[PDB]
Amino acid sequence: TTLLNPYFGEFGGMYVPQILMPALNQLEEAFVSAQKDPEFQAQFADLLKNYAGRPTALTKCQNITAGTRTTLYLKREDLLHGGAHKTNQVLGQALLAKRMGKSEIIAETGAGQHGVASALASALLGLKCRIYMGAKDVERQSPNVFRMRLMGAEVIPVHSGSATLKDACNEALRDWSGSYETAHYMLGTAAGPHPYPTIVREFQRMIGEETKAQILDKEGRLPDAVIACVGGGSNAIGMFADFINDTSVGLIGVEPGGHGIETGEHGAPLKHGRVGIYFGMKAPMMQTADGQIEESYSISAGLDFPSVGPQHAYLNSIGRADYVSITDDEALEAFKTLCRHEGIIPALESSHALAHALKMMREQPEKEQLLVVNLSGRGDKDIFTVHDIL
């Protein structure tokens, strides 16, 4: 029994062991109550404004579009405290944990940004944070691991299975299965069992709300399309949400194409996977013919969730949103182009969204189009990766 619908069409649900159902129901109830509580809303708004730096800028990129009929704006989540949009929702989830009387936080992380975000929120709000991270990721993300520890969080390497994000997801749920009375599981994307896809969207929806107000102020009309990368789905659903009912606005999600869809080395389950049940939800998955879950591959370590949020699978199914992919090389070219022409170093994740907008522009340069790319994070973290490739 739930207060809200756990499904988006066929996708979603609450596929967790029975022992975890009370925790999900408690979380859903706390969330519905918080959404109607003006005190919770004001506290969240105050943290977003005065701690995290909202609203974030909406930057026009004239140098990149010169000579074409494309007008391109970047929603600057790269300027949010922490350097990525993840900060928005961890603040909200930390306030939910405190509303329920929880004192501890559990979080999973792949490349480490969600771990850092969870740790900073926990440090600010007096919560004891523990983060699960696949051992292969721990080895490749020393900087983020050190940040988490500076911020007082415990980082626990996970060596089971592939020792990467999905394995950390499993371990977080294993721990929660025994610790839910005292700990809240701060899931890092708009995926997992209900109510997570819903909560994460609502705690990221200010991205699209601000973008709408900003583009109306600057252009007097809505965008032709808003474009966002899709790892698990949080930055994209945060950008898309406020525009879902604006039927003229295209919603374009960009999954990582890795070395190319035909190689099988990609992270594009929405368009190139098969529906399965894993991580508490029914959604398109990267999986073997037999049903074993596989990893997503991308040059961008943050586009590693091996499935996708259920709301995206649903929006695709009804034709409201369109999903495409961008390869490692396309993303790298977009990264270089933004650095050189706008003086902004984008995260490689976000570079996937930018790359698709660049293709929209370049393929039809005399098409009049007003586009917004969600620049989900800054790319300082990726300079070593890019340097080594070049």
Binding site: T1, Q18, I19, P22, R174, S177, I277, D290, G291, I293
Partner: protein, 265 residues
């Protein structure tokens, strides 16, 4: 078929509880796993609970995580598990055989097809660890259409509505959790009131599981009103400890199962 019903009736006639070991099919290899299973049966197992290696066993602690890893290292697939199940049933006609599955493996290529394959090889029940009663409709319906008992877990704190649903939805046996958390012999888990409410609602006989690793826990479960007990991690550890000595592995499995079964009398 009615293998669980026949077993529990026989056990009740003997005032005995059921002792049900759990192992991962194919750990540490197909041949050794078939030998392990025959040894568990010869040593006194009343029924079997058998896992199919899955990439992400989120209800399992390290011991069973590592059994899954060993099986995968030996290339074990669900198809090979079903070939094993057919052979096990061909040797042992009456022992109840229950599978411990993760949802993706059941849903993957069709829920109905999965339950039909179980029926074909002679499996008696399926417990899908990550399908709560709330999401269980298609699974339980398919199980029933193919004469498979769908097994549901009762948390060590389930409220009345949940007890009524578990009693109504399940068949064969009711899985009674000893505690929160995940599988593991290192963490030991009063279940009398849950046991009584289940009997009141005419639920399938309860088998207590999680943390059962000693004879006195088998006797305690039965004294509390459960029909028996399941032990997995304690069994799996014997496999893990004796990988280099297959013979000693079988001897130690035999000794442990014999001691656990004796405590059910």
């Amino acid at each position: 078929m009615e293998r669980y019903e026949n077993l529990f009736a026989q056990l009740n006639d003997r005032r005995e509880g059921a002792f049900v070991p759990f192992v991962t099919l194919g750990d540490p290899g197909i041949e050794q796993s078939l030998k392990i299973i025959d040894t568990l049966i010869d040593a006194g197992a009343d029924a079997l609970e058998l896992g199919v290696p899955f990439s992400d066993p989120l209800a399992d602690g390290p011991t069973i995580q590592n059994a899954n890893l060993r099986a995968f290292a030996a290339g074990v697939t669900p198809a090979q598990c079903f070939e094993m199940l057919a052979i096990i049933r061909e040797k042992h006609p009456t022992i109840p055989i229950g599978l411990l599955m993760y949802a993706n493996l059941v849903f993957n290529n069709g829920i109905d097809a999965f339950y039909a394959r179980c029926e074909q090889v002679g499996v008696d029940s399926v417990l899908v660890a990550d399908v709560p009663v709330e999401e269980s409709a298609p699974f339980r319906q398919a199980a029933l259409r193919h004469n498979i008992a769908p097994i549901f877990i009762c948390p060590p704190n389930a409220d009345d509505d949940l007890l009524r649903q578990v009693a109504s939805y399940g068949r064969g046996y009711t899985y009674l959790l000893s505690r929160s958390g995940v599988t593991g012999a290192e963490n030991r888990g009063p279940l009398h009131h849950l046991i009584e409410k289940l009997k009141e609602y005419h639920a399938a006989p309860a088998l207590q599981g999680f943390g059962i690793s000693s004879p006195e826990q088998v006797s305690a479960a039965v004294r509390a009103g459960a029909a028996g007990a399941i032990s997995g991690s304690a069994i799996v550890k014997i496999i893990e400890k004796n990988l280099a000595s297959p013979k000693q592995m079988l001897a130690e499995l035999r000794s442990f199962v014999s001691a656990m079964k004796a405590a059910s009398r």
